[PDB]
Nucleic acid binder design. Structure first.
Lengths: 85, 200, 113, 94
RNA sequence: UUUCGGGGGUACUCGAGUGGCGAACGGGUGAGUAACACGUGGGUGAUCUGCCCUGCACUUUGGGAUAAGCCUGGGAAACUGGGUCUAAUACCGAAUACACCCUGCUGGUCGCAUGGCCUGGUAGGGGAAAGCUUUUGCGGUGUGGGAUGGGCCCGCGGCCUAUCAGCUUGUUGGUGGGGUGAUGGCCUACCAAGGCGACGACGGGUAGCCGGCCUGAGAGGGUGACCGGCCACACUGGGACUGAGAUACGGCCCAGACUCCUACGGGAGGCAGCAGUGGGGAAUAUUGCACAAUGGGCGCAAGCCUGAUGCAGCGACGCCGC
């Protein structure tokens, strides 16, 4: 509030927060849809939902929104859940 | 600071002469003041303190400096007495006086403090300067013709120069072979009393 | 980045430095990974000592010298050895040793007689 | 003239995890035993040798260790709260 | 170019603006904290690491905006809405990568059990990038390895008090999920009933810890000023965001106390940074000089910034010398 760089950083941090929030919400929605599909119990829709969600996960990891380890953990969990079904 | 008042006072109080050729001390060898004749009580502390006062008033060194010297001497791996005596004897003014260039230690100190000497080719005016092995003490050329050094260089028949020093040049150079040992110091008093006093 | 800095020592008027290896984020007088030399500019030829092997290792892993340390590395030839451009030539102007006290003592004694 | 496309990592020798020998004093939890360890140091002031006791919690999958058995343990990463030891084998049963 | 009111170009240069990096270092204080906070030694087959160094492979292709500018509205102010318009190393889609990530099968090997390694083999799916500059030219992306900086867990060690004897219910353990960089009741559902304690749990009081410092023959006792390391905090109490990294001192959001502006609608602030002021007190300093040296940030560089720092001023406050 007192130093110019602080004010510029206020604006830039706000815009970065907006972008990260969008990406995280999209990832959460994709994972939730896959979980619902698995709960229904069909394989094929679960299969390419898993494919789309895994692609979304690592491509959001590349953007720096989430750590690559987090994307790996999520992908492992989803694939294991599908395999169990 | 420095002690400035009368000199024979200390000699009379301490019962020995410290200057060396003082007639007033011979005339009255008893302590000064009204009660200089009153008999005194005997105590070890009194004797030790009087020995320390003798030592530190012969060389003109104040109490704090003397205590620093004692700590230094005790720290050294010799024995405390002769170590302290050699530390005292290595002072620049004492070297100048013992070399016969000053009649009294006070004027040796006065000459040193006024920058009349030059040790190892660099001007030194610090009476407490300690002198190591193989030091050359010279009088700077400007003061060679002065009255004090004139009369110092034409009465070289006084007290003998100790072994560890040597006046070598017609210009009265001083060469230091090694720091004196207890045998060659030739000083009054007893160092053991001082060691006892400072161990109290 | 790990850097080769100069930390200050000595008293007020006389700065004497140690050539240390430390992270760029630490303070000037902070903890040092390694001490690989010393530098005394108050002396007339300004004594410089650099441990060549440790300097080579730290330059190899990628430590970045500061400008004074870079100048010293060029002087001692360690920088050129690390790069290899002209060769590693010692431009170091070492202090001239002083005659011994015994030499001058005997010279005075001989001059007397 | 071209450098390798893969640089193998410099091998690091494995560390030595701490080991202990103790006695089982509790086996009331699943897959977990409580082991008592004894240590004999010297008193820092009086110099006498003092025997001191300590309880650790170890992990054994099948739970073959009863109460009173001399067992062997090796340290490990935290398996739970307060669980930091792994049962190697039962030194002697009792 | 000119009527001297100024007008155009340039890009040397540069206010404001977008964008990058920095701002998490450096500087202060010792309130809290009896704790894995600190000291010392280990473990991480349970982990991250921007900039830096060094191998390898790339650096393809397309698009939609917007700040600034211009026009206009609201408000006392703080500040804020709408229209139009414009650029990028800003933002976004795709291709490629098969070094990387996930899953299935499978070989060998080392163990310290989960497991680790051989970039093992194999089948399927997938994951990027940015240009600028003619000059000692600087950059972008993935990936192998170093270096640095961490995170987490553990042994042992350093206060006083039973005129403080019981304490604990996510509390002790398991399973499946979730979460995290990572292990873990860290979180959660279910299951079992454990766990700690006179070798002093649970309470109460006090306290930043250490290298060190003072004293002492030594053992020991007292202490933690300067200097150096770690920790905690930044008006009080919570919270996340951005980021490689956050107790975010000179960031944000909320609540509270206090101080200030207001057209009563609403707004602003945080010296335990450097000087300085008031108060408290027996008692503790200048609203100084400079980036010349060292360290740091940005920049290709010249360079800019730095109350860090280097110096100076005041006080016999101390040591030393005259």
């Amino acid at each position: 509030a007192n130093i110019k760089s602080q004010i510029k950083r206020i604006r830039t941090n706000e815009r970065r927060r907006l972008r990260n929030q969008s990406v995280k919400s999209s990832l959460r929605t994709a994972i939730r849809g896959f979980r619902e599909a698995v709960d229904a119990g069909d394989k094929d829709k679960a299969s390419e939902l898993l494919h789309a969600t895994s692609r979304k996960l690592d491509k959001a990891a590349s953007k720096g929104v989430i750590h690559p380890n987090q994307a790996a953990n999520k992908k492992s969990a989803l694939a294991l859940a599908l395999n169990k079904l | 600071a420095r002690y400035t008042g009368p000199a024979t006072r200390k000699s009379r109080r301490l019962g020995v002469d410290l200057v060396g050729g003082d007639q007033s001390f011979e005339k009255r060898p008893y302590p000064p003041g009204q009660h200089g004749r009153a008999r005194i009580k005997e105590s070890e502390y009194r004797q030790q303190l009087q020995e320390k006062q003798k030592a530190r008033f012969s060389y003109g060194v104040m109490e704090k400096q003397f205590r620093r010297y004692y700590e230094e001497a005790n720290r050294q791996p010799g024995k405390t007495g002769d170590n302290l005596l050699r530390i005292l004897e290595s002072r620049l003014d004492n070297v100048v006086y013992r070399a016969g260039l000053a009649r009294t230690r006070r004027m040796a100190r006065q000459l040193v403090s006024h920058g009349h000497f030059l040790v190892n080719g660099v001007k030194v005016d610090i009476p407490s300067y300690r002198v190591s092995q193989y030091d050359i003490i010279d009088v700077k050329e400007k003061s060679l013709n002065t009255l004090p050094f004139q009369i110092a260089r034409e009465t070289a028949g006084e007290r003998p120069i100790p072994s560890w020093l040597q006046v070598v040049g017609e210009r009265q150079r001083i060469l230091v072979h090694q720091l004196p040992e207890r045998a060659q110091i030739d000083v009054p008093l007893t160092e053991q009393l001082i060691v006892e006093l400072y161990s109290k | 980045a790990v850097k080769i800095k100069l930390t200050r020592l000595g008293k007020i008027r006389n700065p004497q430095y140690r050539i240390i290896v430390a992270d760029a984020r630490t303070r000037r007088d902070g903890r040092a990974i390694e001490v690989i030399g010393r530098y005394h500019p108050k002396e007339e030829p300004s004594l410089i000592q650099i441990d060549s092997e440790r300097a080579q290792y730290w330059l190899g892993v990628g430590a970045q010298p500061t400008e004074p340390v870079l100048a010293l590395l060029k002087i001692t030839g360690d920088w050129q050895k690390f790069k290899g451009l002209p060769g590693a030539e010692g431009t170091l102007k070492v202090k001239e040793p002083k005659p011994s006290k015994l030499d001058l003592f005997n010279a005075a004694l001989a001059e007397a007689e | 003239q071209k450098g390798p496309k893969y640089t193998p990592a410099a091998e690091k020798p494995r560390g030595r995890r701490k080991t202990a020998i103790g006695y089982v004093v509790s086996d009331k939890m699943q897959k977990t035993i409580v082991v008592e360890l004894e240590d004999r140091k010297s008193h820092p002031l009086y110099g006498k040798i003092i025997r001191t006791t300590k309880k650790v919690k170890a992990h054994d999958e099948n739970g073959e260790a009863g109460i009173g058995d001399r067992v062997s343990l090796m340290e490990t990463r935290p398996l739970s709260a307060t669980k930091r030891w792994r049962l190697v084998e039962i030194l002697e049963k009792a």
